[PDB]
């Protein structure tokens, strides 16, 4: 029941005193201390990535870049740098790899693909990759976002009430929020890319039909450091499927 008890006793049994406490609320403080600096770390990482992007002669906002289609150069460079960042974050060690890599833009629906907006052709003689600029532009059409929101909480007196009592390019945040989109997208691509680069093609018959059990292969594969699944309860209604 964890109703910790405690005693003091003088030499020669001259006196004995008792008191008691509980480990409760200590756990709450521990949880707060964890989540705080964890969020801090993640935010810091994001900031670093954005600052790295900032070097790249941003005569324009991001949105403009993809809203244009005439260029490919800037897009390719952005994609590449994203891949690099992910790889390094998995490998705390500088890398340059197979020094021949190229991109092609799937500029039309007839070249489009379900789901995965990115496709590595691992070696058609050499690696190539695909980019759906039209879709990417759809995603960045954004305006889904407004921060004025509300969020799940429960049992606050026990669970949360304690949490009640603690505390030029001068661009705004919404754009940065948007970056997370491509962060996640390139991550999801990196999964498949890494897998196939480490293994055969045929497992694409599974993974690309359904990624699914690929985590089983990833067992013992992850470097003992997590990526970008903090709010682990990502889910939607399911039983409604009415198959």
């Amino acid at each position: 029941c964890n109703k910790v008890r405690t005693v003091t006793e003088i030499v020669n049994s001259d006196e004995k005193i008792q008191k008691t406490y509980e480990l409760a609320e200590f756990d709450l403080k521990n949880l707060s201390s964890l989540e705080s600096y964890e969020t801090l770390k993640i935010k810091l990482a994001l900031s670093k990535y954005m600052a790295m992007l900032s070097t790249l002669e941003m005569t324009q906002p991001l949105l403009e870049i993809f809203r244009n289609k005439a260029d490919t150069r800037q897009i390719a460079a952005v994609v590449f740098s994203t891949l690099a960042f992910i790889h390094n974050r998995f490998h705390p060690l500088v890398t340059n790899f197979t020094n021949k890599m190229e991109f092609v833009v799937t500029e039309t629906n007839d070249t489009s693909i379900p789901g995965e907006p990115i496709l590595f052709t691992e070696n058609e003689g050499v690696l190539l990759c695909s980019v759906d600029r039209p879709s990417i532009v759809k995603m960045l059409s954004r305006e889904f976002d407004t921060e004025a929101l509300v969020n799940f909480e429960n049992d606050n007196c026990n669970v949360r009430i304690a949490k009640t009592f603690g505390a030029d390019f001068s661009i705004t945040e919404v754009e940065a929020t948007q970056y997370l989109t491509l962060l996640l997208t390139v991550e999801h691509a990196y999964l498949h890319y890494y897998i196939f680069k480490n293994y055969g093609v045929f497992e694409y018959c599974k993974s690309l039909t359904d990624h699914s059990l690929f985590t089983n292969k990833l067992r013992s594969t992850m470097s003992t450091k997590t990526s970008n699944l903090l709010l682990s309860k990502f889910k939607f209604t399911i039983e409604d499927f009415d198959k």
């Binding site: 403009e64 809203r67 244009n68 289609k69 005439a70």
Partner: protein, 234 residues
């Protein structure tokens, strides 16, 4: 004025302390004490400018002040000069916007070749004067002038582009507005006209043309078009 960032240190108030130095040199530094009444500031500046206008060569001001309030005081001077002109000699007195203009012209020179970063604006002014009449139309420099002054312009003070320039020259039967040739002494544009009849500038036609253009160019974004319109003359 001139600003470099040799110099004569001129006390910012006492007139005759530097008498005859203001005859001899042309490179005058100025100051002020913190307490100074703005009225006194104006007064001293006026006196200095009068004596300079008596002087035989254009000496150079330099002033060690934050100067935003000095631009305010310049606006005051503008009021003052108008007050005088209510009874005045109608002098062709030189005056300038001192910050917005300033930086703009600096950028202009920078984008051009800069044989003299110290070159006076009036230089460029007259240079365009050389060519205005032959093209009978208004230079963008002069248009941005009377545009980006706080007050004597399109005037962000009150958002008043309505101050369109009607420009006339000797013996003309016609004038040059902000917006093309106009007949003389009339309100800039007839309400009636050979109107921009919608059988041209039909949205549909514009759209079709735009589609054509975008297709051909392979351009995804950044294209907009507008039909031209006409005032008194075509």
């Amino acid at each position: 004025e001139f600003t470099y960032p040799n110099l004569r240190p001129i006390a910012c108030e006492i007139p005759l302390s530097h008498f005859k130095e203001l005859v001899e040199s042309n490179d005058f530094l100025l100051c002020f004490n913190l307490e100074t009444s703005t009225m006194v500031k104006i007064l001293s500046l006026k006196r200095i400018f009068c004596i300079f206008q008596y002087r035989k060569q254009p000496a150079r001001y330099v002033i060690n002040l934050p100067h935003e309030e000095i631009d305010n005081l310049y606006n005051k001077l503008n009021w003052e000069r108008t007050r005088r002109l209510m009874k005045g000699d109608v002098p062709s007195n030189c005056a300038t916007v001192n910050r917005s203009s300033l930086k703009y012209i600096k950028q202009a020179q920078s984008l051009l070749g800069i044989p003299d970063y110290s070159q006076t604006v009036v230089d460029f002014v007259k240079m365009f004067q050389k060519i205005i009449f032959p093209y009978q139309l208004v230079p963008n420099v002069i248009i941005k002038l009377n545009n980006f002054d706080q007050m004597v312009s399109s005037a962000p003070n009150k958002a008043e582009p309505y101050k369109k320039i009607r420009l006339f020259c000797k013996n003309d039967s016609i004038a040059i507005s902000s917006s093309g040739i106009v007949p003389i002494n009339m309100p800039d544009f007839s309400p009636p006209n050979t109107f921009d009849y919608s059988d041209y500038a039909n949205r549909t036609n514009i759209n079709f043309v735009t589609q054509r253009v975008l297709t051909d160019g392979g351009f995804s974004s950044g294209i907009t078009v507008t039909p031209v319109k006409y005032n008194y003359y075509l």
